[PDB]
Design a protein around this ligand. Structure first.
Ligand SMILES: O=N[O-]
Ligand SMILES: O=N[O-]
Ligand SMILES: [Cu+2]
Ligand SMILES: [Cu+2]
Ligand SMILES: [Cu+2]
Ligand SMILES: [Cu+2]
Ligand SMILES: [Cu+2]
Ligand SMILES: [Cu+2]
Lengths: 335, 335, 335
């Protein structure tokens, strides 16, 4: 009986980081408690000052990643402060029943609720807001994130050998539908409510205006690049709650990848590019072998470079000429 | 030799049901005989009364699912009544040769033809009309359905364990390209041929006006919701003859899924959302554990809730608080 | 050490053919040397005379396929002739470090460079141009191709059994973004640079004007249809550097398919339609069992038949009535 299990509290951290956690654990099932507080806020999403009347869990896109182990119970207190203007709820693709929890968590501004479910299936799973009658708007406006449910004995390759990472990063990719006025410029709305009708018109075209990692063009670049070093193994968690994407790490690979994001299935290896179906989260492991600034992107290259679905990984360490060597630098064609 | 095997006649049923059949069978190979009659008709596809100048196998979108076992031969009599305007035929993705049967089943109005092929590969396979030079149009206007070739000893998990279902449901998803006039309203055409030029313009934009399950918005909802109960295992067969989709059961999972639809391959488990490549049929098993109304949808949520790609499953039974419980109902935040 | 391994030179051949190679080999690792020369050129891409200001590796869309074996080193000399307008480079998805090679092969017109990398992972991998700030334009204008890294002991089925092909064909599929003038007709530009701004605005709409195999509508039809015969096994290599596609052989199957294109993973069998993610190359084997003209296409049928993503395979041999038979030819409905 779950009420009699030990309860532990986890403090969530902002993306792209993930809160500390164990992979293989000797611990038995717990009720792991989390709190998230909804925040509606206008956000600048590109270098030209275009804004999004956004909606978020915990003030970020994506929402923070919640990690537990298979057999644990997730107990979330969802808070919708009075400072907000719209109702919300939460649907966990990792949960069973009641439309993922959305039926049991309808919180209007000024309310909160607490939900518990058993995390009985391992994998990366999307959670997102889903108010009846306007699910897409709330999702495309920013309300999604990942629940990672690791197996108790950690991650395994297809032969049962253990796989281990030194660091997890979480990337949420958001297809945005920002309206334009008659002058062809993006509209800037004084209120969330005012953005609704025009935004739904754009959504229905199925053509996003921007596709961003972690909330804006350039979110994971420059000072905010992800970081690693040669010999380090990273897990890259990638969520897309509404639309397909095809992650790729330029100059690297997916050493082991769960593109459908479910760890009881054997991963695939050596992938150049993988595929995250809209409404899911997948995960890739990679162990760096070369230093340099890598790009991690959606390999529809228009969506990456023109619409924003690209970030970087700055990697420290020593260059390996056996893996790759510039035999002759760019020079005049022999005459 | 095929001519010397026992012949048997199966009566097809209208989607979303699937005609009665065995999973594991003791029976040996048979020539299984099916008849289908092409019906061109004007159908109402949304709640505003928009119409499609539709083309169907047997009067429904999708056509009925034909079920046989691996090793059986399928023998179809395709009738094109005199009252239709156009020539038609049939291409079975499950068959080998002559463009899937299409070159051997060219029936003009007033004609019929009979085709036999060996169903030597197990899986769900799309069949669709494919008249030379008119293929996209006949397919997007409704002419597709599923052939399921069950393995003789039934469905297997990756370790070879048997998987069994209590009820199969068949969902066809249709991307529709309905034209609009200068006033921005959907056009209503008196004849099939009248719809052609305008429909082709809309098709070339690759943007569907509507995406529907089983022929219309709301087809699998209300009185026509699918049904199940706690403890029951359903097989959800999903076809999309022209365009990708990404099925998801909200509040549930894909316990075992063949997203590429081919049963000699091992399935994957615990999927939140899977992927049906345009031009294919796939199949998912799920055993319900909670009662309630579930949504089964294409998890591009715009595609689902704005354009029509969603249905419901009403599930009877007892709520299980271990799996999910409302610890605290929505209430005001302590001030 | 790579410097001391034997070096051999391979002469590339024009798609759809692949240069002669072994599958299983007794040879040890080698540094395999290749040369490619970039050709910018205006090309006619459809039957009404529409032109693309194209960029190519070696004069063709796709660039030729490079075949080596796992553990070999690839050593490419990349030549950008004095007569081209733009800088180029190469990113091998099969290589590790320096953005796939891109940072080490920045060749302005009149320059060349030589890159070595270890092909330590088996599979079909995209290579494509990637000059900083112009990646999408160069890829969609035609600068991509496949590296096939064959395992030393050749292709294997899921149980470890060997799989052998008699002939490989390489199909590169290109989503094109050709601009239109105010009159609604496709623009025809005098120079490459003239095409830039307009092309970028089409690209951002995410809607291709054309999607073609090997450079143009009907490139692989008529006199240029691919060829085979009953009993022959072919390997069909399919690359898409920018956008998803869903290949299908009409009247056939993918007997064994690596849709993510990585040969250390077990393939899937009996596929009707497979899925090549944007930014990847995949591979399918089929053994022909019926003669006739097959269509090989992207099974979004609008993309295939309206936009151009279709070709043909003409197959010689003897019809097999057990696989498929016209029991009754089209004839009047009985009365
Ligand atoms: O490797 N894609 O830029
Ligand atoms: O079988 N696709 O036309
Ligand atoms: Cu919300
Ligand atoms: Cu969802
Ligand atoms: Cu037809
Ligand atoms: Cu087809
Ligand atoms: Cu280039
Ligand atoms: Cu690339």
């Amino acid at each position: 009986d779950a009420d009699k299990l030990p309860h532990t509290k986890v403090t969530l951290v902002a993306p792209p980081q993930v809160h500390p956690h164990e992979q293989a654990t000797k611990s038995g099932p717990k009720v792991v408690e989390f709190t998230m507080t909804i925040e509606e806020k206008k956000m600048v999403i590109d270098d030209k000052g275009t804004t999004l009347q956004a909606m978020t869990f915990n003030g970020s896109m994506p929402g923070p990643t919640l990690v537990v182990h298979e057999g644990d119970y997730v107990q979330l207190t969802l808070v919708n402060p009075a400072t907000n203007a719209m109702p919300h709820n939460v649907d966990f693709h990792g949960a069973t029943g009641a439309l993922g929890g959305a039926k049991l968590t309808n919180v209007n501004p000024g309310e909160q609720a607490t939900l518990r479910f058993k995390a009985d299936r391992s994998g990366t799973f999307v959670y997102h807001c889903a108010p009846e009658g306007m699910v897409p708007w709330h999702v495309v406006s920013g309300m999604s994130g990942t629940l990672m449910v690791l197996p108790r004995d950690g991650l395994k390759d297809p032969q049962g050998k253990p796989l281990h990472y030194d660091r997890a990063y979480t990337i949420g990719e958001f297809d945005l539908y920002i309206p334009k006025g008659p002058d062809g410029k993006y509209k800037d709305y004084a209120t969330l409510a005012e953005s609704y009708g025009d935004t739904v018109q754009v959504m229905r075209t199925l053509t996003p205006s921007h596709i961003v990692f972690n909330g804006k063009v350039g979110a994971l670049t420059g000072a905010n690049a992800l970081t690693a070093k040669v010999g380090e193994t990273v897990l890259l968690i990638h969520s897309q709650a509404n639309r397909d994407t095809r992650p790729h790490l330029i100059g690297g690979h997916g050493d082991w990848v769960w593109e459908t994001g479910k760890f009881a299935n054997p991963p695939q290896r050596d992938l150049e590019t993988w595929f995250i179906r809209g409404g899911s989260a997948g995960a890739a492991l990679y162990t760096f072998k070369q230093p340099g600034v890598y790009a991690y992107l959606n390999h529809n290259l228009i969506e990456a470079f023109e619409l924003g679905a690209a970030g970087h990984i700055k990697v420290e360490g020593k260059w390996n000429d056996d893996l790759m060597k510039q035999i002759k630098a760019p020079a005049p064609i022999p005459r």
